[PDB]
mmCIF file of C-alpha atoms in Angstrom:
data_model
loop_
_atom_site.group_PDB
_atom_site.id
_atom_site.type_symbol
_atom_site.label_atom_id
_atom_site.label_comp_id
_atom_site.label_asym_id
_atom_site.label_seq_id
_atom_site.Cartn_x
_atom_site.Cartn_y
_atom_site.Cartn_z
ATOM 1 C CA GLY A 1 0.000 0.000 0.000
ATOM 2 C CA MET A 2 3.159 2.213 0.037
ATOM 3 C CA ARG A 3 3.008 5.940 0.585
ATOM 4 C CA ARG A 4 6.365 7.288 -0.754
ATOM 5 C CA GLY A 5 8.043 10.470 0.474
ATOM 6 C CA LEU A 6 10.958 12.595 -0.554
ATOM 7 C CA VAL A 7 13.148 14.756 1.739
ATOM 8 C CA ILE A 8 15.454 17.208 -0.099
ATOM 9 C CA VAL A 9 18.363 17.951 2.227
ATOM 10 C CA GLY A 10 20.510 21.141 2.120
ATOM 11 C CA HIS A 11 23.234 22.706 4.299
ATOM 12 C CA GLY A 12 23.269 25.494 6.876
ATOM 13 C CA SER A 13 22.950 28.503 4.551
ATOM 14 C CA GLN A 14 20.324 30.913 5.731
ATOM 15 C CA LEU A 15 20.535 33.073 2.652
ATOM 16 C CA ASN A 16 16.956 33.817 1.715
ATOM 17 C CA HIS A 17 17.364 32.918 -1.964
ATOM 18 C CA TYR A 18 18.826 29.457 -0.847
ATOM 19 C CA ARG A 19 15.709 28.801 1.106
ATOM 20 C CA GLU A 20 13.584 29.971 -1.849
ATOM 21 C CA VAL A 21 15.410 27.671 -4.332
ATOM 22 C CA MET A 22 14.921 24.625 -1.983
ATOM 23 C CA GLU A 23 11.262 25.477 -1.740
ATOM 24 C CA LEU A 24 11.018 25.956 -5.576
ATOM 25 C CA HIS A 25 12.202 22.319 -6.086
ATOM 26 C CA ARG A 26 10.065 21.030 -3.277
ATOM 27 C CA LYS A 27 6.963 22.681 -4.751
ATOM 28 C CA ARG A 28 7.676 21.595 -8.301
ATOM 29 C CA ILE A 29 8.091 18.009 -7.142
ATOM 30 C CA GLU A 30 4.972 18.139 -4.885
ATOM 31 C CA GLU A 31 2.917 19.376 -7.818
ATOM 32 C CA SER A 32 4.168 16.671 -10.055
ATOM 33 C CA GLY A 33 2.637 13.966 -7.967
ATOM 34 C CA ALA A 34 5.796 11.872 -8.227
ATOM 35 C CA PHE A 35 5.645 11.330 -4.388
ATOM 36 C CA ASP A 36 2.958 11.326 -1.726
ATOM 37 C CA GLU A 37 4.869 13.928 0.417
ATOM 38 C CA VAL A 38 7.848 16.173 -0.319
ATOM 39 C CA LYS A 39 9.712 18.073 2.414
ATOM 40 C CA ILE A 40 12.899 20.085 2.796
ATOM 41 C CA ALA A 41 15.349 19.649 5.643
ATOM 42 C CA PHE A 42 18.797 20.871 6.585
ATOM 43 C CA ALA A 43 21.791 18.766 7.759
ATOM 44 C CA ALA A 44 23.024 21.518 10.068
ATOM 45 C CA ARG A 45 22.740 22.386 13.721
ATOM 46 C CA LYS A 46 20.358 25.177 14.614
ATOM 47 C CA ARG A 47 18.436 24.862 11.390
ATOM 48 C CA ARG A 48 14.928 23.414 11.105
ATOM 49 C CA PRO A 49 13.782 20.944 10.302
ATOM 50 C CA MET A 50 16.767 18.651 10.514
ATOM 51 C CA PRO A 51 16.345 15.333 8.425
ATOM 52 C CA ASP A 52 15.521 13.265 11.523
ATOM 53 C CA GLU A 53 12.798 15.777 12.552
ATOM 54 C CA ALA A 54 11.372 15.779 8.989
ATOM 55 C CA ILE A 55 11.249 11.983 8.737
ATOM 56 C CA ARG A 56 9.602 11.665 12.144
ATOM 57 C CA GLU A 57 6.831 14.075 11.031
ATOM 58 C CA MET A 58 6.213 12.158 7.725
ATOM 59 C CA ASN A 59 3.778 9.213 7.741
ATOM 60 C CA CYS A 60 5.144 7.590 4.592
ATOM 61 C CA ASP A 61 6.163 3.956 4.465
ATOM 62 C CA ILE A 62 9.284 4.618 2.409
ATOM 63 C CA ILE A 63 11.196 7.929 2.331
ATOM 64 C CA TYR A 64 13.937 8.840 -0.111
ATOM 65 C CA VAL A 65 16.431 11.417 1.138
ATOM 66 C CA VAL A 66 18.216 13.336 -1.608
ATOM 67 C CA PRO A 67 21.272 15.553 -0.703
ATOM 68 C CA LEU A 68 20.974 18.791 -2.781
ATOM 69 C CA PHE A 69 24.752 18.956 -2.988
ATOM 70 C CA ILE A 70 27.296 19.375 -5.705
ATOM 71 C CA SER A 71 29.959 17.305 -4.033
ATOM 72 C CA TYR A 72 30.515 14.750 -1.290
ATOM 73 C CA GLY A 73 31.164 17.230 1.472
ATOM 74 C CA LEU A 74 31.051 16.467 5.173
ATOM 75 C CA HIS A 75 27.342 17.265 5.264
ATOM 76 C CA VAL A 76 26.707 14.293 2.938
ATOM 77 C CA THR A 77 29.275 11.702 4.179
ATOM 78 C CA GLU A 78 29.064 12.544 7.923
ATOM 79 C CA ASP A 79 26.341 14.896 9.123
ATOM 80 C CA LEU A 80 23.290 13.681 7.252
ATOM 81 C CA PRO A 81 23.940 9.940 8.033
ATOM 82 C CA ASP A 82 24.813 10.748 11.707
ATOM 83 C CA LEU A 83 21.514 12.579 12.067
ATOM 84 C CA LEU A 84 19.593 9.598 10.663
ATOM 85 C CA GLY A 85 21.673 6.898 12.362
ATOM 86 C CA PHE A 86 22.970 5.631 9.096
ATOM 87 C CA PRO A 87 26.570 4.592 8.064
ATOM 88 C CA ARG A 88 28.926 7.393 7.108
ATOM 89 C CA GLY A 89 30.589 7.642 3.708
ATOM 90 C CA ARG A 90 29.491 7.757 0.067
ATOM 91 C CA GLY A 91 26.845 5.944 -1.934
ATOM 92 C CA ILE A 92 23.214 4.839 -1.674
ATOM 93 C CA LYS A 93 22.212 3.701 1.814
ATOM 94 C CA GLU A 94 19.138 1.661 2.652
ATOM 95 C CA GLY A 95 17.918 1.358 6.228
ATOM 96 C CA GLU A 96 15.144 2.249 8.649
ATOM 97 C CA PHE A 97 14.254 5.118 10.847
ATOM 98 C CA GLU A 98 11.655 4.491 13.524
ATOM 99 C CA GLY A 99 10.198 1.691 11.515
ATOM 100 C CA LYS A 100 10.082 3.638 8.255
ATOM 101 C CA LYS A 101 12.098 2.439 5.277
ATOM 102 C CA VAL A 102 14.612 5.212 4.405
ATOM 103 C CA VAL A 103 17.001 5.327 1.439
ATOM 104 C CA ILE A 104 19.662 7.997 1.485
ATOM 105 C CA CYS A 105 20.438 8.693 -2.181
ATOM 106 C CA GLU A 106 23.657 10.161 -3.706
ATOM 107 C CA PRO A 107 24.163 13.890 -3.987
ATOM 108 C CA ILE A 108 23.069 15.379 -7.335
ATOM 109 C CA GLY A 109 26.416 16.939 -8.442
ATOM 110 C CA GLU A 110 27.682 14.229 -10.870
ATOM 111 C CA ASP A 111 24.341 13.790 -12.644
ATOM 112 C CA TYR A 112 24.185 14.468 -16.363
ATOM 113 C CA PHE A 113 21.304 16.731 -15.475
ATOM 114 C CA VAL A 114 23.759 19.060 -13.657
ATOM 115 C CA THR A 115 25.867 19.066 -16.883
ATOM 116 C CA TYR A 116 22.746 20.035 -18.747
ATOM 117 C CA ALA A 117 21.860 22.721 -16.171
ATOM 118 C CA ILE A 118 25.248 24.217 -16.908
ATOM 119 C CA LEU A 119 24.568 24.148 -20.671
ATOM 120 C CA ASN A 120 21.053 25.562 -20.141
ATOM 121 C CA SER A 121 22.439 28.551 -18.222
ATOM 122 C CA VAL A 122 23.932 29.415 -21.635
ATOM 123 C CA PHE A 123 21.140 28.148 -23.916
ATOM 124 C CA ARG A 124 18.181 29.251 -21.730
ATOM 125 C CA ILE A 125 15.740 26.814 -23.354
ATOM 126 C CA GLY A 126 12.438 26.872 -21.393
ATOM 127 C CA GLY B 1 34.191 33.714 -37.396
ATOM 128 C CA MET B 2 33.363 33.336 -33.647
ATOM 129 C CA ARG B 3 35.239 30.968 -31.393
ATOM 130 C CA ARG B 4 32.936 30.449 -28.342
ATOM 131 C CA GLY B 5 34.161 29.551 -24.857
ATOM 132 C CA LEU B 6 32.616 28.505 -21.603
ATOM 133 C CA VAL B 7 34.004 29.161 -18.086
ATOM 134 C CA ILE B 8 32.286 27.172 -15.294
ATOM 135 C CA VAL B 9 32.794 29.117 -12.071
ATOM 136 C CA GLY B 10 32.753 27.586 -8.544
ATOM 137 C CA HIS B 11 33.551 28.793 -5.004
ATOM 138 C CA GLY B 12 36.529 28.376 -2.687
ATOM 139 C CA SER B 13 36.038 24.729 -1.679
ATOM 140 C CA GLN B 14 39.221 22.759 -1.954
ATOM 141 C CA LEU B 15 37.559 19.456 -1.231
ATOM 142 C CA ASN B 16 39.017 17.042 -3.739
ATOM 143 C CA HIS B 17 35.661 15.621 -4.847
ATOM 144 C CA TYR B 18 34.458 19.285 -5.543
ATOM 145 C CA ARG B 19 37.358 19.771 -7.849
ATOM 146 C CA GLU B 20 36.662 16.381 -9.473
ATOM 147 C CA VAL B 21 32.950 17.196 -10.056
ATOM 148 C CA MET B 22 33.875 20.585 -11.696
ATOM 149 C CA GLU B 23 36.315 18.774 -13.918
ATOM 150 C CA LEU B 24 33.695 16.040 -14.734
ATOM 151 C CA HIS B 25 31.333 18.750 -16.137
ATOM 152 C CA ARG B 26 34.132 20.560 -17.870
ATOM 153 C CA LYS B 27 35.262 17.357 -19.597
ATOM 154 C CA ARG B 28 31.775 16.259 -20.554
ATOM 155 C CA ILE B 29 31.112 19.651 -22.114
ATOM 156 C CA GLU B 30 34.536 19.761 -23.876
ATOM 157 C CA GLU B 31 33.845 16.362 -25.403
ATOM 158 C CA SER B 32 30.474 17.399 -26.607
ATOM 159 C CA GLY B 33 31.879 20.004 -28.901
ATOM 160 C CA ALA B 34 29.231 22.501 -27.810
ATOM 161 C CA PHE B 35 32.040 25.135 -27.333
ATOM 162 C CA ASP B 36 35.494 25.742 -28.749
ATOM 163 C CA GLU B 37 37.079 25.892 -25.216
ATOM 164 C CA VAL B 38 35.768 24.960 -21.771
ATOM 165 C CA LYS B 39 37.567 25.944 -18.555
ATOM 166 C CA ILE B 40 36.914 25.926 -14.822
ATOM 167 C CA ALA B 41 37.625 28.851 -12.535
ATOM 168 C CA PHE B 42 36.968 29.825 -8.945
ATOM 169 C CA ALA B 43 35.498 33.129 -7.644
ATOM 170 C CA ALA B 44 37.624 33.021 -4.499
ATOM 171 C CA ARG B 45 40.883 34.495 -3.321
ATOM 172 C CA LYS B 46 43.860 32.172 -3.249
ATOM 173 C CA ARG B 47 42.302 29.748 -5.675
ATOM 174 C CA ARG B 48 43.409 29.307 -9.290
ATOM 175 C CA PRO B 49 42.490 30.151 -11.839
ATOM 176 C CA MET B 50 40.222 33.008 -10.888
ATOM 177 C CA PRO B 51 37.624 33.949 -13.702
ATOM 178 C CA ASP B 52 39.660 36.971 -14.833
ATOM 179 C CA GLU B 53 42.818 34.801 -15.155
ATOM 180 C CA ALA B 54 40.855 32.133 -17.094
ATOM 181 C CA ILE B 55 39.325 34.627 -19.527
ATOM 182 C CA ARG B 56 42.680 36.289 -20.161
ATOM 183 C CA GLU B 57 44.191 32.888 -21.094
ATOM 184 C CA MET B 58 41.287 32.033 -23.507
ATOM 185 C CA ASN B 59 41.502 33.230 -27.130
ATOM 186 C CA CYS B 60 37.774 32.994 -27.815
ATOM 187 C CA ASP B 61 35.793 35.871 -29.250
ATOM 188 C CA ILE B 62 32.815 35.321 -26.962
ATOM 189 C CA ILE B 63 32.965 33.634 -23.534
ATOM 190 C CA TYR B 64 29.986 32.535 -21.480
ATOM 191 C CA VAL B 65 30.570 32.381 -17.731
ATOM 192 C CA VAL B 66 28.238 30.032 -15.872
ATOM 193 C CA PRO B 67 28.129 30.134 -11.992
ATOM 194 C CA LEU B 68 27.899 26.480 -10.772
ATOM 195 C CA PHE B 69 25.798 27.636 -7.840
ATOM 196 C CA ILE B 70 22.532 26.647 -6.297
ATOM 197 C CA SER B 71 21.630 30.104 -5.109
ATOM 198 C CA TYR B 72 22.484 33.768 -5.563
ATOM 199 C CA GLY B 73 25.164 33.909 -2.918
ATOM 200 C CA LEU B 74 27.766 36.632 -2.578
ATOM 201 C CA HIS B 75 30.097 34.749 -4.906
ATOM 202 C CA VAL B 76 27.560 35.224 -7.733
ATOM 203 C CA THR B 77 26.187 38.755 -7.032
ATOM 204 C CA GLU B 78 29.467 40.329 -5.792
ATOM 205 C CA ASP B 79 32.696 38.375 -6.170
ATOM 206 C CA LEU B 80 32.436 36.984 -9.675
ATOM 207 C CA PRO B 81 31.305 40.346 -11.239
ATOM 208 C CA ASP B 82 33.943 42.303 -9.210
ATOM 209 C CA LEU B 83 36.644 40.001 -10.541
ATOM 210 C CA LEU B 84 35.489 40.560 -14.133
ATOM 211 C CA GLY B 85 34.684 44.264 -13.761
ATOM 212 C CA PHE B 86 31.036 43.681 -14.314
ATOM 213 C CA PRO B 87 27.956 45.129 -12.438
ATOM 214 C CA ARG B 88 27.013 43.440 -9.186
ATOM 215 C CA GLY B 89 23.629 41.836 -8.581
ATOM 216 C CA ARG B 90 21.476 39.162 -10.220
ATOM 217 C CA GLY B 91 20.681 38.267 -13.805
ATOM 218 C CA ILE B 92 22.396 37.864 -17.178
ATOM 219 C CA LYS B 93 25.168 40.395 -17.791
ATOM 220 C CA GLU B 94 26.682 41.207 -21.162
ATOM 221 C CA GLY B 95 29.946 43.118 -21.420
ATOM 222 C CA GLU B 96 33.593 42.915 -22.422
ATOM 223 C CA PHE B 97 36.803 41.872 -20.854
ATOM 224 C CA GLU B 98 39.991 42.963 -22.573
ATOM 225 C CA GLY B 99 38.195 43.202 -25.847
ATOM 226 C CA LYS B 100 36.490 39.822 -25.545
ATOM 227 C CA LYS B 101 32.705 39.629 -25.439
ATOM 228 C CA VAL B 102 31.733 38.069 -22.064
ATOM 229 C CA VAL B 103 28.245 37.090 -20.881
ATOM 230 C CA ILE B 104 27.858 36.209 -17.236
ATOM 231 C CA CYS B 105 24.907 33.800 -17.102
ATOM 232 C CA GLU B 106 22.579 33.035 -14.129
ATOM 233 C CA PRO B 107 23.475 30.409 -11.571
ATOM 234 C CA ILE B 108 22.052 26.939 -12.312
ATOM 235 C CA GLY B 109 20.010 26.406 -9.086
ATOM 236 C CA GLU B 110 16.484 27.337 -10.328
ATOM 237 C CA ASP B 111 16.739 25.347 -13.564
ATOM 238 C CA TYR B 112 14.235 22.575 -14.165
ATOM 239 C CA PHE B 113 17.276 20.439 -14.793
ATOM 240 C CA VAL B 114 18.224 20.788 -11.086
ATOM 241 C CA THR B 115 14.647 19.625 -10.244
ATOM 242 C CA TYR B 116 15.238 16.665 -12.489
ATOM 243 C CA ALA B 117 18.666 15.980 -10.937
ATOM 244 C CA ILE B 118 16.861 15.729 -7.630
ATOM 245 C CA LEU B 119 14.325 13.268 -9.089
ATOM 246 C CA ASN B 120 17.116 11.283 -10.795
ATOM 247 C CA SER B 121 18.950 10.829 -7.484
ATOM 248 C CA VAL B 122 15.875 8.719 -6.642
ATOM 249 C CA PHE B 123 15.146 7.215 -10.078
ATOM 250 C CA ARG B 124 18.790 6.652 -11.151
ATOM 251 C CA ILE B 125 17.944 6.501 -14.865
ATOM 252 C CA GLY B 126 21.212 6.417 -16.881
#
């Protein structure tokens, strides 16, 4: 019967446009219907919600956690897994949090879609 | 007769995987043939090359400068234009540097391709 959620995870920036860009993706994805619930969270102290707080609040059966990061920085290999009780390091990680299935995905930076975002900053199609 | 170049501009991170991701995009784009010359540069003191140094070295007639940034941080609205002698703030900027036509493009963060990079971290197509 699986309800599927997505948590998009950023860093500690409190620049207003950073928050607005995270929300822009979250809203676009929510509207798409690709998932049952889409939330943003931050892998940083004194920011809210943190990824553990966001997953606790979500009633989905399986939750994918995507690091909105260009590179494998310490937020991705250490902080985000520590906060969720998951193994440190790189790669996809499957596990549980409070009975919920959770899959921590890879950061987005090496995707061909980031290569194409770079080209589209020039081409401006769409 | 225009030779066209691309400079992909990052921040001051010296994490090795950050450098490797910038090179990954640079190489993919070079191989594509989309431009005559593709270089990386960094909008940060004590990093090399800076965007002014990279544009001086390039013999292209027109050079597009793409900020590999999620948001309009100070690197994008202040540092990168200061280094090139261009107006501060947001948006596309057309101008010259040492006789070369230079267009500073918008950061990549709001592109639909970043939305799709986020989905593809889940879907892993390709």
